[PDB]
Design a binder for this molecule. Structure first.
Ligand SMILES: CC(C)Nc1cc(Nc2nc3ccnn3cc2F)ncc1C(=O)NC[C@@H](F)C(C)(C)O
Length: 294
């Protein structure tokens, strides 16, 4: 064993009975996803993030338990500066909690949208975050794991804006390697075409990272129901068809972006976004191209 086993009452005590008010207004709520809500807490003077798993999407209790077990297994095997650190968990009763080191700058998604009044990320910080995220994915792939849910909401940022990959509940270990599933899971706006069908491959993680690189350049979320186009990957088509340029989509909330490094990041993203999985570069090549960029 490597993680502290908490009793559920202890985590109820340290999160102020899972206070639903936002942290910005003195509550404990930091965010939510399809598989749970994240609360801020204090455990023995340590600031923690407590993910209470109770489902808000179409998932069964046994599927939640499988994702909880999967997260613990991946966390026990993978430790890296660009991966979040699991401190412990609670499993007593019908409730499941995962306890982590708190992330002072929350998620990349929230920082790109300046949620809660945080200042816009400079181009220089965006480049370092992209490099950190690729190093995290590279470590996971080297250790034969496929993330299956890479998105900006799953890239967290510490006090220094060091990128940290999170949410390993859907991660798959692969010794051999394309395989199939009957339960399609993930965020549609980021998912590779084959992943949307049910294929499981490390090449899908590359496609999803390409979408993240477009959110970093543009400051636009991957999907926006009230936007034209609603899907960010459609801008790649508009740019490829010469109807627009990447310069027309650069986030206006920054003053330090230069055309050379922006075009270089866009080139990495377009390569990641090849329709044909085998045309996409491997994570070590993505890592190398992002290093050449700076
Ligand atoms: C729930 C996500 C969006 N927000 C966090 C996750 C985390 N920690 C973790 N959360 C999760 C959720 C799943 N894995 N995971 C790993 C983690 F280490 N820590 C802090 C925040 C958080 O919101 N911090 C506050 C800052 F954004 C501030 C600017 C001051 O509002």
């Amino acid at each position: 064993t490597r993680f502290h086993s908490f009793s559920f009452y202890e985590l109820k005590n340290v999160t102020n009975n899972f206070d639903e008010r936002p942290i910005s207004v003195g509550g404990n709520k930091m965010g939510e996803g399809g598989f749970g809500v994240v609360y801020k807490g204090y455990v023995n003077n340590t600031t923690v993030a407590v993910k209470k798993l109770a489902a808000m999407v179409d998932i069964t209790t046994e599927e939640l338990k499988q994702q909880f077990d999967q997260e613990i297994k991946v966390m026990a095997k993978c430790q890296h500066e660009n991966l979040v650190e699991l401190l412990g968990f609670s499993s007593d009763g019908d409730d499941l909690c995962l306890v982590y080191v708190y992330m002072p700058n929350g998620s990349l998604l929230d920082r790109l949208s300046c949620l809660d009044g945080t200042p816009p990320l400079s181009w220089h910080m965006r480049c370092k975050i992209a490099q950190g995220a690729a190093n995290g994915i590279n470590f996971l792939h080297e250790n034969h794991h496929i993330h299956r849910d890479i998105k900006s909401a799953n890239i967290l940022l510490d006090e220094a804006f060091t990128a940290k990959i999170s949410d390993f509940g859907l991660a798959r270990a692969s010794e051999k390697q394309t395989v199939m599933t009957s339960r399609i899971v993930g965020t549609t706006a980021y998912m590779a075409p084959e992943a949307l069908r049910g294929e499981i491959t490390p090449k899908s993680d590359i496609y999803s990272f390409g979408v993240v690189l477009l959110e970093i350049i543009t400051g636009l979320p991957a999907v926006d129901e009230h936007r034209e186009p609603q899907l960010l990957l459609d801008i790649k088509e508009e740019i490829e068809d010469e109807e627009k340029t990447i310069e027309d989509y650069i986030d206006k909330k920054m003053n330090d972006a230069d055309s050379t490094s922006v075009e270089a990041m866009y080139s990495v993203a377009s390569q990641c976004l090849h329709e044909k999985k085998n045309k996409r570069p491997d994570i070590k090549k993505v890592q190398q191209l992002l290093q050449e960029m700076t």
